[PDB]
Swiss-Prot record, chain A:
<comment type="function">
    <text>Positively regulates expression of listeriolysin, of 1-phosphadidylinositol phosphodiesterase (PI-PLC) and other virulence factors.</text>
</comment>
<dbReference type="InterPro" id="IPR012318">
    <property type="entry name" value="HTH_CRP"/>
</dbReference>
<dbReference type="InterPro" id="IPR014710">
    <property type="entry name" value="RmlC-like_jellyroll"/>
</dbReference>
<keyword id="KW-0010">Activator</keyword>
<feature type="domain" description="HTH crp-type">
    <location>
        <begin position="136"/>
        <end position="201"/>
    </location>
</feature>
<keyword id="KW-0805">Transcription regulation</keyword>
<dbReference type="GO" id="GO:0003677">
    <property type="term" value="F:DNA binding"/>
</dbReference>
<keyword id="KW-0804">Transcription</keyword>
<dbReference type="InterPro" id="IPR036390">
    <property type="entry name" value="WH_DNA-bd_sf"/>
</dbReference>
<dbReference type="InterPro" id="IPR018335">
    <property type="entry name" value="Tscrpt_reg_HTH_Crp-type_CS"/>
</dbReference>
<keyword id="KW-0843">Virulence</keyword>
<dbReference type="InterPro" id="IPR036388">
    <property type="entry name" value="WH-like_DNA-bd_sf"/>
</dbReference>
<dbReference type="GO" id="GO:0003700">
    <property type="term" value="F:DNA-binding transcription factor activity"/>
</dbReference>
<protein>
    <recommendedName>
        <fullName>Listeriolysin regulatory protein</fullName>
    </recommendedName>
</protein>
<dbReference type="GO" id="GO:0005829">
    <property type="term" value="C:cytosol"/>
</dbReference>
<keyword id="KW-0238">DNA-binding</keyword>
<dbReference type="InterPro" id="IPR018490">
    <property type="entry name" value="cNMP-bd_dom_sf"/>
</dbReference>
Amino acid sequence: NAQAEEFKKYLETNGIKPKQFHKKELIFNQWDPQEYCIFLYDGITKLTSISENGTIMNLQYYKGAFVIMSGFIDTETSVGYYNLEVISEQATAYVIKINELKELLSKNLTHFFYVFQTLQKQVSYSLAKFNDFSINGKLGSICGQLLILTYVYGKETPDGIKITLDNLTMQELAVSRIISKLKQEKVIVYKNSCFYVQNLDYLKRYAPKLDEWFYLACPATWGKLN
Amino acid sequence: NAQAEEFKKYLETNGIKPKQFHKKELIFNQWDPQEYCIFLYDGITKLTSISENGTIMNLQYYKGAFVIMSGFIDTETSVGYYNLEVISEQATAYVIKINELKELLSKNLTHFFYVFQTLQKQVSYSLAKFNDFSINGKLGSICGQLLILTYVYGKETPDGIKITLDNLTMQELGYSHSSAVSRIISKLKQEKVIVYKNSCFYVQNLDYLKRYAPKLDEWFYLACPATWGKLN
Ligand code: NA
Ligand code: NA
């Protein structure tokens, strides 16, 4: 991701230093009155919410390089009260107050467009997941998440497409019903302490709009397993 | 609003004329290779995806003023195979090409921020919708849709917060028939939180919708506080 490398070099040349975080550690929480822009450079995180009765809901997942923003860029108020929790063993992220982001992007249109496109990618990803859901319910939801894991952390082997993601990260990342029936049906295989995908076509068949979204947004990655 | 009218005058000053569209017309279709930024100034539209077997899927509804885009601004490549259908009797929208938009935004950062924040609102909207869903299933989904309808087209009257929306648009949204949905709707009608009278919906217990769709209420507060304050 050359755009992300250029973005980090821009950040550092302007005195913003990388921070490291450990699993379960929060980059920002939902009660923070300071709005941020997190350039998640490396690792995996989850955007979660805490309801009034303390129930934790997992809303989204992100992997570096990506941009998460807790405030609006111009008004600098909150876009929504959330927590960004690290779920990989380690994570590297650049934390910026929203106003400093406004300045930095204001003096560079290239990286401004980069962050813009990260927003666009979120929006189109949401639309594709909603389409796949409207068509196939939770089967399509799970097929889409499995397809994303396949395209991202997938490696071909004589046994299938190994999802080379740490087993602990996989655990951290009705459901059981249809996934048991999926591996029942040989779409996935949980042999040798890891998931091997052996029916990519099935996944694509049931998450067609997310497959399209990945084809357009991550064409390089999409082209290796197709 | 103010920012929308400023963006409209900016577009016109840069030689971008508005365009009219009748109901069911397509502002753009999935096969058009040209990418666009669409500034829907007036009216209502819907973003559809057509599956292999022809099933038109309704993904999202947009109301003017708002901004839709079919291409990524950095790479100038498509964000997806979508259609933008007008569901209003009439709609006024500006059709800019993606590269022309890049030029126009690079020349004035206030409009750049306007569009940036539009996308931010859309992202956080999806997040809030999914949160309320994960919490309260279809009850929360329905309460949230009713809440956003009430904030947009709400009109305070002795009969509650009337939903100032055509019965045609209301049928397009389907409120007027899924089994599960009817079950929820009937309970709500019987409880006297929504009353369907005068061929139109009224809301008499906004607190119920706000309580069983909390994250969307929060979203409206944080991104549309002008509208949120009218009914609070
Ligand atoms: Na916060
Ligand atoms: Na397109």
